[model samples]
Target: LSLSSDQLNHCHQALGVFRGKIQNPDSIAHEFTGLQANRMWPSELLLNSTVAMNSVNVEKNRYSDVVPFDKNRIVLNPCKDSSAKGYVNASLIKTSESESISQFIATQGPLPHTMEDFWEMVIQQHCPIIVMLTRLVDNNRTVKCGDYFQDEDGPREFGNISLTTKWIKTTDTSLMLRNLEVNYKETEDQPMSVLHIQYPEWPDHGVPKDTVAVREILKRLYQVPPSLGPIIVHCSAGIGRTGTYCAIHNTIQRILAGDMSALDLAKTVALFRKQRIGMVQTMDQYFFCYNAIVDELEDLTA
Candidate 1:
């Protein structure tokens, strides 16, 4: 779905128009209708969800609208908990040829009851990175995500999985970095190390002030070989900010590898929704993709 030369030119102009209206939500009441490729509204983007909708797995979902499509949903190993029935609200975004081995596993933040399932997915998937895009709670005191992993305070055990925080640090750009170790009693697999990156500055249903720190998250992961496993990314419902980050990372990598015939942000986002529903959730997020991508293209191409 790469853009042609004229299409790329239109993307540049469309982004310019979008940038002016981004700061004031009132100015851009409607989305950029030009992205004919995008299908955020669910009614028209029909898809299957029998597994996600099963009465047993209802509680596993954070939002009714954010369920994973059965076609590409992530299934957990069967357990005594028959209710779960191997259901997890996560999707595997396959790595493209451009990046060679990098792929992403997008899911919602861990719920109190689903904590064990979250770790199980990490262990089974052999994921080396956990990129959290939302805070446990917001500045307004509303709980955004459950405290799935303990910090330097101590180690925490979930069911058969043991999670220990080896180290934790805060970057100058306000990124929270944590080195975590995972061990599963059910198998003889060696312990796995996971790099957890949390960016609390990004607002829900809104874009970041700028792309400086956001880009830093991608830069830090450049060293982590994607062949290890899909990098797990989550925010509240695992669509808005999470989807935006994936779009920027995938697009920028294509540019660096000289793989994209031409840049087309709309096609990029639409492709993401194919793997999971409701990606780039709002217009603000859609516009922010252009903002982040255009910003990084300048620094890298320069």
Candidate 2:
């Protein structure tokens, strides 16, 4: 049965019951205690069709358009056969072929050994120095630093590619950039931000933690500008965590610019799918990311 206006209104009312209610992992089981897992009865339920809408500012790469990211933003995306080509933007972050037997896995996959293959691809991309470190920022290190004579000197002396290392911040956007620096930025002169996030583990329900870090990265894009070039973002295959963050970032930009409506959920999902096929891989993550924004709005207004 199609949900009538009255039925939708009822659902809206039900939603109000949980307004401002956020449940951590430990509480989710208890929070949904009364609900049965197999009680669904609806089949082919339909609703009144609505016209599709488009965003006014339809620039897919607008933020990068006006910024200096080409040089400032560094990327850590990996290349694997043809799949990698789909996500890696040459004009954005440079891409390198995967060195391991398998591609970059977003989970408990093999880690890169000796910045050798990693640096090789980056240098070819003309990226001077970038590092991929452990999860903790305190333990973060620049495996290769262009500013260091050893790192930068290679390109200078051996006629190998050169890399530029420097500090970058997000002053371009208002609210989200602060968090970007907090989750990123090891030191003042670290040219690139290394995110060693492991999906399903690092994201941790993709809630308050992972979403916060992704928001920082997005804020950088909105504020830092494209003149900065491409920022390195990788969590394994650049699918699960990577896609989720970019989708949230893009979706928010569209919403804040008054280009989309909450009712257009399916369209947003469809569009994001085209952008990154595996974007928002999990239903929980998708819903969580979307809700986080709504929660932020309600929290700010409350």
Candidate 3:
């Protein structure tokens, strides 16, 4: 796509906004602090939503990171003669107000107990892609997320959901791509194809050393038709790195479409927090969003 002169100018202006904020770490810290202090959902409002959903329990949440209120939660269809069991610790992440198709589901990495529920949500939502930002174990000791997918032993069974690995390929940019088929043993529905894209080099609550690998992941996702279900994104808490990736992806799409308003990282992050709390978890992670987007802008506008 050719960038018009006007688009090129907007790109530079956007890069300037990010460059100024990321260069001074104190600016990021102060802005983050102010957001924490003043911008938040009411405690009672969030509490009441959780209470109304008897199927969802705070204790069941994999992490202390706040789950989205019911209005944003992905609801599974009720099985015949049974009430819907679709309440999971996941929320639909709206990328923009004007666009409706390019969405995402942001949730915490699955715990051992929530593995079944996690797969259920994927099948229910018809999610064609899953972007895992964390590893099964981090620092060689901490169990960040459950080994919920297929392994050498064979296909893994999470309750009635069966996941069979179809193929695996590694990109030069430190990304692992897996094609998996998921099916429900209890139903006659056909199996679904889901892509698992993982970027393990990303540090927890920190930015990657660079944005090449992360941007590569975004490029690959461009192949998937936008009409498909929202891509599922998760890290340990599903906020820090998860939010950063979402912010970068969202901004790039908007800017490429000539929407210069995507330049506002603060607004993008704020929009994400409205969907899922604690998104863009730390100031460094927040800064990384700007850095990643600005770098992408350079490439796009060049």
Candidate 4:
């Protein structure tokens, strides 16, 4: 998907136009509302598929409101002892024309009981990167996410999967990066180095005050080899901020590849929603996708 010289100009020009579109909240809201009116792929379709009702069952779900559909649920390696063959609140997002070459496993934050299953899915899928968009606890002292990974020294064991933080590095901005050794104790398989990236400053259902920090996260992720496994991305709900980040990452990559069609924020969001329900959850987050992409494009042009 290499871009020609003409397409390069088209990307810059379209970004300039989109730059104006995001300036007015009312304008963006009106367009977003209209886009929702004619949603090409409603999330209810995925929820209505066979076995999706199983996700709603309390025993299988982490949160009653947050459940993954059977259509895209990440299947774990079958364990002879377990009857629940494929049950996890995570969905596999494949690469598409509207998205980057990188794939993602977008899921809800792990609970106390699901921590082991979460690590199981990570190992089974061979995932090497995790981007956590929410904090363990918020300002209200509410438990937003589980303490799945050990931030300091010493290893944390979750069932057969063991996690050890090799080293940690904090950036000047909102990003916190960690290199961890993920080992499967049951098998002779060597430990895999997984990068855990977190941005704890983001609000639950809103955009960051500025896109600089978020764009920095994208820049670091772009350096990772695409041949690796899919990147695991999650927030408290796993749809709002997770979807927004994926949208920005996808849009920027497509534009750089000279795909001017990436400028369509509405279409990109809609395609993502098809893969997982409630992606780009709020109108503000939807607007943030455009603002972030355009900001990156403008900088590239500058």
**Candidate maximizing TM-score:** 4
- Give the lowest summed-lDDT range of ten residues in model 2: 44-53
**Model 4 worst lDDT window (10 residues):** 48-57
Alpha-carbon runs more than 4 Å astray in model 4: 1-11, 23-26, 38-52, 55-57, 95-100, 151-153
The TM-score obtained by model 3 is 0.87
Q: After superposition, how far is residue 91 of candidate 3 from its true place, in Å?
A: 0.7
Ten-residue stretch with the least lDDT total in model 3 = 78-87
Question: TM-scores for all candidates?
Answer: 0.84, 0.40, 0.87, 0.88
lDDT of every predicted structure (CA atoms): 0.78, 0.32, 0.79, 0.78
Candidate 4 residue-wise lDDT, 47-75, digit = tens: 44344355333555555656666667787
Model 1 lDDT-worst window of ten: 28-37
lDDT for model 4, please.
0.78
lDDT of 1 by residue, 11-75 (tens): 45544544455566454344445443446566533348778888899898888878888887888
lDDT of 1: 0.78
The deviation in Å at residue 250 for candidate 3 is 0.7
The model with the greater TM-score, 2 or 3, is 3
Best by lDDT: 3
lDDT accuracy of residue 71 in candidate 2: 29
- What is the lDDT for 133 in model 2? 16
Q: Cα miss at 63, model 1 (Å)? A: 0.8
